[PDB]
Amino acid sequence: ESADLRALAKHLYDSYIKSFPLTKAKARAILTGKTTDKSPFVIYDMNSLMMGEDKIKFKHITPLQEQSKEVAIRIFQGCQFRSVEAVQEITEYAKSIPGFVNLDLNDQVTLLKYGVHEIIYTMLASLMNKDGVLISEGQGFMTREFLKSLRKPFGDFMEPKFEFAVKFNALELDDSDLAIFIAVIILSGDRPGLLNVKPIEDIQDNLLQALELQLKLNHPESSQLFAKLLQKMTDLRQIVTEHVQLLQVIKKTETDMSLHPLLQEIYKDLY
Amino acid sequence: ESADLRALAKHLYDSYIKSFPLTKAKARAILTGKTTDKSPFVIYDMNSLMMGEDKIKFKHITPLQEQSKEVAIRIFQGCQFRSVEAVQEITEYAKSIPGFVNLDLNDQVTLLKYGVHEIIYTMLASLMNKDGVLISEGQGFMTREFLKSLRKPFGDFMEPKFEFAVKFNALELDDSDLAIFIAVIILSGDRPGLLNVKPIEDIQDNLLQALELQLKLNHPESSQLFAKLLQKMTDLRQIVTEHVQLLQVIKKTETDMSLHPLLQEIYKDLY
Numbered sequence: 156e157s158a159d160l161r162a163l164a165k166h167l168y169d170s171y172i173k174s175f176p177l178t179k180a181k182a183r184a185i186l187t188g189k190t191t192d193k194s195p196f197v198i199y200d201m202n203s204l205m206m207g208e209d210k211i212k213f214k215h216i217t218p219l220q221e222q223s224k225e226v227a228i229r230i231f232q233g234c235q236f237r238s239v240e241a242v243q244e245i246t247e248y249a250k251s252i253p254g255f256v257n258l259d260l261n262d263q264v265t266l267l268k269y270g271v272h273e274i275i276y277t278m279l280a281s282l283m284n285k286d287g288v289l290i291s292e293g294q295g296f297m298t299r300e301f302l303k304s305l306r307k308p309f310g311d312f313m314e315p316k317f318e319f320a321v322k323f324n325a326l327e328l329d330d331s332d333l334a335i336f337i338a339v340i341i342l343s344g345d346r347p348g349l350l351n352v353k354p355i356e357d358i359q360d361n362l363l364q365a366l367e368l369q370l371k372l373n374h375p376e377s378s379q380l381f382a383k384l385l386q387k388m389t390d391l392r393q394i395v396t397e398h399v400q401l402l403q404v405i406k407k408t409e410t411d412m413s414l415h416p417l418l419q420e421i422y423k424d425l426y
Numbered sequence: 427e428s429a430d431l432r433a434l435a436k437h438l439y440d441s442y443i444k445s446f447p448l449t450k451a452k453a454r455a456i457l458t459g460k461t462t463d464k465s466p467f468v469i470y471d472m473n474s475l476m477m478g479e480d481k482i483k484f485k486h487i488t489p490l491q492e493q494s495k496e497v498a499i500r501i502f503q504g505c506q507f508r509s510v511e512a513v514q515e516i517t518e519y520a521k522s523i524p525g526f527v528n529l530d531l532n533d534q535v536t537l538l539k540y541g542v543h544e545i546i547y548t549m550l551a552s553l554m555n556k557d558g559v560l561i562s563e564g565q566g567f568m569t570r571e572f573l574k575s576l577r578k579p580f581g582d583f584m585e586p587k588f589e590f591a592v593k594f595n596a597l598e599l600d601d602s603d604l605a606i607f608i609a610v611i612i613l614s615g616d617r618p619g620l621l622n623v624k625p626i627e628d629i630q631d632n633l634l635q636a637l638e639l640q641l642k643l644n645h646p647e648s649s650q651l652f653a654k655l656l657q658k659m660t661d662l663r664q665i666v667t668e669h670v671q672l673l674q675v676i677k678k679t680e681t682d683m684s685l686h687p688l689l690q691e692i693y694k695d696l697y
């Protein structure tokens with residue numbers, strides 16, 4: 156029923172505000188200059204990278220860990236710490252999706268293990284434009300061209316996220332749209348190894364109707380936006396399959412890699 | 427007006443019904459036997475627990491989880507699971523408390539973070555008699571004797587809850603009283619790290635007013651029941667500190683991990 160779906164939508168948005176400190180609206184205010192506080196330091200090369208860390212003089216122990224390597228490894232290493240925080244944030248949000256915590260525990264685990272990267276790329280787009288990406292709570296900006304320039308495999312991790320972002324961003328979703336899209340991703344009844352598919356699909360279906368109504372109301376002039384958004388779920392899946400192949404390239408071409416423990420769990424025997 | 431205070435009580439009883447499908451009225455019927463028809467499986471020992479494990483598996487699988495560990499640890503993990511579910515119900519009931527969703531978003535989160543435990547023990551009492559507690563939406567009944575017999579750290583967890591429940595249950599609160607009492611507890615202006623204290627005390631003051639009038643009307647022969655009930659709100663703080671201090675034992679001294687990343691961030695600065 157409409158009132159039910161509108162109230163589902165407001166719940167997820169409210170909870171999305173509570174779970175994700177840097178929302179699209181705040182990322183864009185920062186991207187755009189509209190903010191009034193502190194303009195982000197841009198990293199375009201080795202020297203400004205050095206200075207970007209070396210900002211640690213009127214800056215602090217930047218929540219990540221410590222670095223005994225080179226540029227390409229060090230950047231991939233700062234990506235891991237951020238994706239670990241994103242996973243925590245996304246798990247905290249999932250628990251608020253009505254019906255999620257009442258599911259079989261193994262199913263909750265599998266839903267998260269498969270959904271979490273799709274959602275990291277979805278929301279990474281929020282922080283991106285065609286020239287670069289906001290990093291460190293919006294205190295920095297790394298250029299697309301710098302990330303793309305990185306030695307073979309590392310450089311290969313970056314570009315396809317930017318090509319995705321540019322296209323997803325042209326859909327002009329805002330946070331309240333995104334909040335339902337991401338819950339829809341989480342509640343995917345076709346993740347490998349699910350014990351109890353139907354009660355997951357029943358929830359997804361109801362999220363789907365809510366996302367539908369939210370796009371009609373919020374973007375009345377935008378034709379077939381709902382479909383165009385669900386088409387994006389396959390751009391997402393292909394980013395993940397690509398990312399995973401690139402991860403295998405990293406075991407071969409690199410010395411001691413071993414991701415953060417929680418990410419190794421995520422990647423352990425994945426699709 | 428008193429009529430506005432009655433309308434508030436009434437509005438709160440209605441949200442409460444919606445949020446919490448197993449009510450005190452329903453649970454007391456099951457602990458006794460009103461229209462005696464669909465009796466919970468009783469779990470009184472280690473054998474009956476297994477008999478009752480693969481009883482909800484001689485049907486299917488939506489579990490807290492199956493045989494894969496030590497029994498005292500499975501029971502304690504099953505409680506954690508139930509308590510992550512219960513935080514979702516409380517969270518929703520809170521949105522229906524007037525003024526709550528207009529509070530600072532961060533204060534909302536802090537009110538729930540610290541109010542939630544006190545509310546879980548208050549509501550657990552509705553499911554308990556002197557001899558046992560209804561579990562799994564009222565389908566099981568686990569005996570206090572059996573909980574008490576588990577090995578030394580786990581054998582002491584539930585017992586303080588039973589002792590509180592017996593003293594609390596002797597007050598003979600119904601759901602309509604508890605709906606108000608639960609709302610007073612949430613709106614406690616003394617939780618650590620509250621930004622705006624005053625607006626919270628102003629809502630709690632109108633809840634206190636409604637609570638006081640409810641009990642005066644519903645329980646005219648209980649002299650000073652308002653007061654005895656506020657006094658219970660110290661008895662609860664103490665169960666909660668003792669519970670929080672027993673989570674330090676488990677974490678420091680026990681091997682098994684398979685915990686819930688929603689309670690674990692909740693115990694920062696907690697009494």
Ligand SMILES: CCCc1cc(C(=O)c2ccc(-c3ccccc3)cc2)ccc1OCCCN1CCCc2c(OC(C)(C)C(=O)O)cccc21
Nearest residue numbers: 207208229230233234235237238275290291312313316418
């Ligand atoms: C979800 C994380 C996305 C992401 C995060 C950041 C940062 O937080 C960051 C912050 C600080 C530094 C830094 C490091 C050294 C000196 C100065 C600054 C570097 C990076 C910077 C760029 C960035 O995205 C660009 C492309 C996204 N990307 C490509 C590299 C691998 C990767 C990724 O890989 C790991 C292995 C973490 C994974 O599978 O989870 C996960 C999600 C995105 C992603």
